Amino acid sequence: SDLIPAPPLSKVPLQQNFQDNQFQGKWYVVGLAGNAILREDKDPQKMYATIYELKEDKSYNVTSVLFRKKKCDYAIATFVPGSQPGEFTLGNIKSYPGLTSYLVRVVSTNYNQHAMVFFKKVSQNREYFKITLYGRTKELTSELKENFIRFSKSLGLPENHIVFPVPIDQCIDG
Numbered sequence: 001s002d003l004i005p006a007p008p009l010s011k012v013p014l015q016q017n018f019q020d021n022q023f024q025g026k027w028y029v030v031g032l033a034g035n036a037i038l039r040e041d042k043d044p045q046k047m048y049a050t051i052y053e054l055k056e057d058k059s060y061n062v063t064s065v066l067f068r069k070k071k072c073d074y075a076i077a078t079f080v081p082g083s084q085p086g087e088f089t090l091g092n093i094k095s096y097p098g099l100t101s102y103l104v105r106v107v108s109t110n111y112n113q114h115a116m117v118f119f120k121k122v123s124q125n126r127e128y129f130k131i132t133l134y135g136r137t138k139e140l141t142s143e144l145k146e147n148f149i150r151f152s153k154s155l156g157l158p159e160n161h162i163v164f165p166v167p168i169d170q171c172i173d174g
């Protein structure tokens with residue numbers, strides 16, 4: 001098992017003055033990069049969506065909806081506010097076997113069109129990280145997509161570790 005090393009947190013910017021209420025709602029995954037993400041031209045990555053909902057204790061209810069094997073698949077997690085706004089840790093980490101750490105950092109966002117989010121986890125002692133380019137719609141300008149490519153590269157990732165999921169209508173239009 002071989003992995004590109006997780007970048008130092010100093011190389012991962014934090015979105016300033018993070019507004020947690022404005023980050024709520026559905027985001028489409030228009031770009032996906034990481035040391036475990038690989039471009040697969042035979043069976044290309046389908047677009048999925050992630051929905052953020054503020055609980056009254058100001059932690060997030062996070063639901064991901066994916067189109068897999070002709071059905072809609074639902075992954076639930078809780079994001080608990082971390083050291084500073086825009087940073088999060090994972091709730092009920094014990095319910096995930098082999099998972100020792102999980103970090104979420106909102107790198108950049110304008111809340112109503114786009115967002116870039118950095119994730120880092122240690123699972124079975126292996127360090128994984130990913131950057132998601134979130135779009136409020138299924139499509140984003142080639143400029144924003146290029147910014148995402150340059151940011152992914154700055155964290156050590158080559159082009160074959162950066163994918164742009166193909167837009168779909170099943171499951172993610174709810």
Ligand SMILES: O=C(N[C@@H](CO)C(=O)O)c1cccc(O)c1O
Pocket residue numbers: 034035036037119120121128129130
């Ligand atoms: O790369 C990741 N996971 C792969 C499995 O190890 C994957 O299949 O996407 C990954 C990295 C950081 C944070 C994550 O939630 C995550 O799924």
Ligand SMILES: O=C(O)c1cccc(O)c1O
Pocket residue numbers: 064066075
């Ligand atoms: O369980 C998944 O496949 C999944 C879906 C959306 C986001 C993730 O991080 C996941 O691990």
Ligand SMILES: O=C(O)c1cccc(O)c1O
Pocket residue numbers: 075076077096099
């Ligand atoms: O974000 C998650 O729900 C999650 C938790 C543990 C392991 C994963 O890969 C995840 O995507």
Ligand SMILES: [Fe+3]
Pocket residue numbers: none
């Ligand atoms: Fe994950």
